[PDB]
UniProtKB/Swiss-Prot annotation, chains A, B:
Record-linked InterPro entries: Dup_hybrid_motif, LECT2, LECT2_chordata, Peptidase_M23
Induction (record text): By phytohemagglutinin (PHA).
Organism per entry: Homo sapiens
GO cellular component annotations of the record: cytoplasm; extracellular space
Protein name: Leukocyte cell-derived chemotaxin-2
Length: 133, 133
C-alpha cells in the first residue's frame, strides 16, 4: 500500500501474528471488544517514521493510566487520519513528511514481555487500515 | 541442557536461524573466522536471565567502537564460563544465581537492521555451548 515503512529496521510494514498475549490483525480477539487497529512489527527502541505526509494533530495516549508505553500521536493529511501508539514523538503538533522521523518505540517488552513488539496503528474512525500498509 | 531460559517471555532457548546478516549456530559463517558462540533469540528490551549460578567477572564489550549494543559481561562458576554480548547488565561484578535477572537486551536493530534480535553467548574457551542451552 501507499504508506511508508514505519519501523526503522524494516523492508515493509509487516503485521503482528499471534503470541502469548494475543494477535495483531485488525479485529483480532481482545477482551471487551475486538482489536481496533493493526499492530505493525517494530523493535523496542527503534526509530519510527511517518507513514504519510500531514500534520501531527496532537498527543494521543493509548491508555488512561501511566505505564512505560503510554504515549502516541494523531496525524492527518493526504486523505489519511491515524492514531499511532507506543511512541515517544519528536513533537505533539506541526507538519510531518512521509518517511520523516516521527519518534522512538517505547519499551514494549517491559509492559508485555513476550509480545511481538509493534506500533499499534488505528484509523481515526477505527476502520480497517490494513490496505494502506 | 542445564542452563536456564535466558530471554524473558520465551519458553526456551532457541537459536537464531539465517537472516540477511548471517546465521546463529555455532561455527556459522562469519568474515575471517567462524561464529565463536551461539545466538539465542530474544527481543530488544527484554529482560535477560543468568544461564547458571556464578560470578559476574567484569564488563566484556563485543566491539572496539561504541554503538547501541556494545556491552556485555563475562560470567563464571559451577564449571561454566561464558561471555554474553548485547546486554546492559545490572552490574559488572558480583554473584548471580541461575535464572536471576542479569540485565536487558540492547537494541540490535539500530546496529544491524533486519537481523533477528538475540543475545550472543560464547564459552570462554570458544567451545560449542549448544548442548547446555
Ligand atoms: Zn494493537
Ligand atoms: Zn553470535
Amino acid at each position: 500500500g501507499p504508506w511508508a515503512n514505519i519501523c526503522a529496521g524494516k523492508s515493509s510494514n509487516e503485521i503482528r501474528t499471534c503470541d502469548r498475549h494475543g494477535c495483531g490483525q485488525y479485529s483480532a480477539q481482545r477482551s471487551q471488544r475486538p482489536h481496533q487497529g493493526v499492530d505493525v512489527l517494530c523493535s523496542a527502541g527503534s526509530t519510527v517514521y511517518a507513514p504519510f505526509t500531514g500534520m501531527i494533530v496532537g498527543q494521543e495516549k493509548p491508555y488512561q493510566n501511566k505505564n512505560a508505553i503510554n504515549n502516541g500521536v494523531r496525524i492527518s493529511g493526504r486523505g489519511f487520519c491515524v492514531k499511532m501508539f507506543y511512541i515517544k514523538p519528536i513533537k505533539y503538533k506541526g507538519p510531518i513528511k512521509k518517511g520523516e522521523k516521527l519518534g522512538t518505540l517505547l519499551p514494549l517488552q517491559k509492559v508485555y514481555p513476550g509480545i511481538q513488539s509493534h506500533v499499534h496503528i488505528e484509523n481515526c474512525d477505527s476502520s480497517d487500515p490494513t490496505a494502506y500498509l
